[PDB]
């Protein structure tokens, strides 16, 4: 039962994951301030105790540690250097952790600003999907000022299973876009072999019975099969989110020579994916990138 | 369970062979062996088996063969070579293709052993060498159903499970799709960890960070570890991954199905065995990947 | 104008390419016996003068040269191995040359049992298309029994542009499947760019334009970008034959482990057009495959 | 035989390219002064009458019309917003012309940023090669403002083939980068080929003249097998160009949901070349990735 920090909390983002990581922080005792580009999002927050910002500027004003959890580079750059953006807000004593899961450019050069004003700054972008956000079962992969990593230590704790310190602003994000590019792979895979199953007569029922049964077996295959199995494609994590990442990944090893021909494979799948109108429902929707 | 009163043959004392027939000979069961090179034998004799001189006397000799060799290819030629099992065949015989082959060559293969009497099933086996030692294999079986039931003590003597997923090919089909799935998730974990090699990232934090997520199983753990400590020693076989990859593959183009995911894989392992990988771990495919 | 040879022709699949061959070894005087598995479309060559054979066995007992040219490996193999098949009629003297495009290791198959009843063998597989079997301009690639080679002279003059001689058994079906591995490559590369430029609001036509200026500018890319502009997939090259041969280029790296990454995933976009039912369609029509 | 502009000409960049470019626009009667990062390229051009520029902005400044021609979108953008860069030498009027091969997104940027100084824009990417380059027979594929393409009436010529107008900014790019994805492409598949035909015992000399008598002969494909089979890679058009090329097409698919397995696949067989250091080997140096 770890105690509350002092300090207080800011939060941008109510999304798939954010929303998750507000609850808990909220539950385990923490002031927190919130904001969400659609104001509508906050309403439940506020019913559990949060205070409502009106913009990003003003929440980092206001707070001590400010969270970001958006959902691209795009987004995340916007959030800091739009009007009414983090950076204005931004003065010596205030902290900014990035949650998005971006390249580690990204995150090098908003590092780099913020920073410039005063500011400090944390990477700790999450491994995990909504309903492990909404347990507090997230795994935090962090990188940069270290100091700040020790203050949100009960904020990690709140939101999270376990936390990693990886070094220097780059890192989490590099290991980030590897754990959800093995992710990402993994799922186009299971997607190839249930749908070859259905068309070759065999029961994917029981071929996951056998996966089961056998070494590969886990939490995420089986349950990415169940949804598969029950037409349920309610996303836990957006397709549009993991082919965002395998590009990103992609990107990674195009910036070091390495082929990544996995990936690379993976990622033309999910693009039909998204061209079938899949990018808003689960990443686990890409079977219907293989459907006849 | 009590072992079954029939002669039991075994053809092929490979890295899967080799523990089943352990596992067959320490749960009390007669077993009969032969192995192309004579020699493997010899560790089984002092086991308690008996040596057969030739597949078509095994066949002869036993109640129920089983054989477990590599390729369709050496399927084919076990059972319709020189002293080769079609040829001990006779009324009431029993044949159990244990081989990872196509569909078509287990119907082939189906077809000529009841064409001389004999009742065929095929059980085709998920797991490894490891596995295979500790009699705790998958078994998936197609065929003959009361030949299945005729198999109960020695299933559960090399096996953890049993699948019987119905008429000749069916598992064959099924096997395929499961290494299908296995071959390409370790391409995917080589290139992973590659990737995390060539960009100054931990390969060992990768792991630790997989091992608390929903992907944690015992193949990403144990498949990871080998590439950590560089140990490529043969759990199961490179080249016979490679060709599960090829036929599953072969599977798809017959139903107008792309598997570019396994076409992906497939590319790699060959990469693999042109870098000399073939009788290496199917973790091997590592190299493919290193600079 | 080359004076054609005395001896009785035997010719077996008029096909999509045998019936143009069989049209232009009439026209230029050769005596040829014709057979197809369907009997009709044996009568178009009745007033060309054809004599019209009950089956391969006996076409093979009457004629000098056989020629065949059939779809698949299985095709070519159940036509010589089946019932009245080619072996039948083979004795000591008699020759065979098989047409079809299929792999090493069925013409090594077959060569060897058509031999060992005394026939002499010659693999003679064609690059070329409806068009060019028509107007007698197909590319030869033969390999096998020299002398049988330079007895089709004249048949290969009639039937074809040009002739090479690549030696033992099995090195023209290598070559040929070497040839249409990049034909189908290409193709499905001209298919991706087409609908890359569509999708991007780019012209099409213009991409032609661009392309026919430039050093890529061949007969091949003019004329199958022009079936695409008009919508017409109408076969002169079938779209499940060149999957075919990318399936087989494909299996014929594998045996020499040697990776053809292109080539897979050219034979994946065909496997799609295939499942979407384009197999009977012209090669361009993989365009369906990339169509939104 | 056109009359040349009166306009003052400036160029910026004398790379592969550039370097040709400029040499047609000299001999053609131009007036041009040259600018490159490294002073001693210069040199030569001196000598063929061009006046020497000490920075991009004073080149701008005295000039009506500015060509520039850089590697990357990174070197594209630095040349304009860096240092003495071209954005502090446009004032009213002043045209600045960029045949880079860049985004849409880089040339969109761009424009802005000049337009917004009161300059005029034109993208005016070049397909060709420094063969194509120094005997002024590229295609030239331009964007942008109309007034000042045909201001450029007598450089293209120079420097030119033929030129296609594509209308608004942006439309130039996205071609260019289809283009060059269909010839990177088709390169890795003819290695492929060669390479296949080399491993399973057959002549790499005899495969190129098949295919210099199918359907598919092109000077690129001759020209292209030539080099390998001479084992010369001299660099007409750097391989890390055609790789920057084949990601930049592959992005261009991500942005409106269409997959580029082609592409995809290419793009990693010459991250695996650039591994193996050919960067600045001529694009068929891909050849390189497949050799066992
Ligand atoms: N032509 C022929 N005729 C008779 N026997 C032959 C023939 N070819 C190989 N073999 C035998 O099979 C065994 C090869 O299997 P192994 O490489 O150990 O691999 P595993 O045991 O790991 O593989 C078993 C299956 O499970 C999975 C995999 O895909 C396989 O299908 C070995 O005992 C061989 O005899 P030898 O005399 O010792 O060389
Ligand atoms: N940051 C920056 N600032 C100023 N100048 C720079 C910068 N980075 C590179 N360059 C210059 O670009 C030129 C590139 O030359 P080259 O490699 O021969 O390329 P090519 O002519 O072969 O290719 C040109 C384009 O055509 C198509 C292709 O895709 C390319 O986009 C070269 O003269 C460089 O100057 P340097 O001092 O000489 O090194
Ligand atoms: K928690
Ligand atoms: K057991
Ligand atoms: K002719
Ligand atoms: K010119």
Same mark, same amino acid.
């Given at each position: 039962?770890?105690?509350?920090?002092?300090?207080?909390?800011?939060?941008?983002?109510?999304?798939?994951?954010?929303?998750?990581?507000?609850?808990?922080?909220?539950?385990?005792?923490?002031?927190?301030?919130?904001?969400?580009?659609?104001?509508?999002?906050?309403?439940?927050?506020?019913?559990?105790?949060?205070?409502?910002?009106?913009?990003?500027?003003?929440?980092?004003?206001?707070?001590?540690?400010?969270?970001?959890?958006?959902?691209?580079?795009?987004?995340?750059?916007?959030?800091?250097?739009?009007?009414?953006?983090?950076? $204005?807000? +931004?003065?010596? *004593?205030?902290?900014?952790? /990035?949650?998005?899961?971006?390249?580690?450019?990204?995150?090098?050069? #908003? &590092?780099?600003?913020?920073?410039?004003?005063?500011?400090?700054?944390?990477?700790?972008?999450?491994?995990?999907?909504?309903?492990?956000?909404?347990?507090?079962?997230?795994?935090?992969?962090?990188?940069?000022?270290?100091?700040?990593?020790?203050?949100?230590?009960?904020?990690?704790?709140?939101?999270?299973?376990?936390?990693?310190?990886?070094?220097?602003?780059?890192?989490?994000?590099?290991?980030?876009?590897?754990?959800?590019?093995?992710?990402?792979?993994?799922?186009?895979?299971?997607?190839?072999?249930?749908?070859?199953?259905?068309?070759?007569?065999?029961?994917?029922?029981?071929?996951?019975?056998?996966?089961?049964?056998?070494?590969?077996?886990?939490?995420?295959?089986?349950?990415?099969? $169940?949804? +598969?199995?029950? *037409?349920?494609?309610?996303? /836990?994590?957006?397709?549009?989110?993991?082919?965002?990442?395998?590009? #990103? &990944?992609?990107?990674?090893?195009?910036?070091?020579?390495?082929?990544?021909?996995?990936?690379?494979?993976?990622?033309?799948?999910?693009?039909?994916?998204?061209?079938?109108?899949?990018?808003?429902?689960?990443?686990?929707?890409?079977?219907?990138?293989?459907?006849?």
């Amino acid at each position: 039962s770890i105690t509350p920090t002092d300090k207080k909390i800011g939060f941008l983002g109510l999304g798939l994951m954010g929303s998750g990581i507000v609850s808990n922080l909220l539950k385990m005792g923490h002031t927190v301030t919130v904001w969400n580009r659609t104001a509508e999002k906050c309403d439940l927050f506020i019913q559990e105790g949060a205070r409502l910002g009106r913009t990003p500027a003003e929440v980092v004003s206001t707070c001590d540690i400010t969270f970001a959890c958006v959902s691209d580079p795009k987004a995340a750059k916007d959030l800091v250097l739009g009007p009414s953006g983090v950076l $204005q807000g +931004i003065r010596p *004593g205030k902290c900014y952790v /990035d949650m998005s899961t971006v390249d580690a450019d990204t995150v090098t050069e #908003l &590092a780099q600003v913020i920073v410039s004003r005063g500011g400090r700054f944390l990477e700790a972008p999450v491994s995990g999907n909504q309903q492990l956000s909404n347990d507090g079962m997230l795994v935090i992969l962090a990188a940069g000022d270290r100091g700040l990593y020790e203050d949100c230590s009960s904020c990690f704790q709140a939101m999270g299973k376990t936390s990693f310190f990886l070094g220097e602003v780059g890192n989490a994000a590099k290991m980030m876009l590897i754990v959800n590019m093995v992710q990402g792979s993994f799922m186009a895979t299971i997607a190839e072999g249930l749908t070859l199953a259905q068309v070759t007569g065999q029961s994917q029922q029981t071929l996951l019975d056998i996966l089961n049964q056998g070494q590969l077996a886990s939490i995420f295959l089986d349950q990415k099969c $169940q949804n +598969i199995l029950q *037409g349920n494609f309610k996303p /836990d994590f957006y397709l549009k989110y993991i082919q965002k990442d395998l590009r #990103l &990944a992609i990107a990674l090893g195009d910036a070091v020579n390495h082929p990544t021909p996995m990936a690379a494979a993976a990622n033309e799948v999910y693009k039909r994916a998204k061209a079938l109108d899949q990018s808003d429902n689960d990443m686990s929707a890409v079977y219907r990138a293989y459907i006849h």
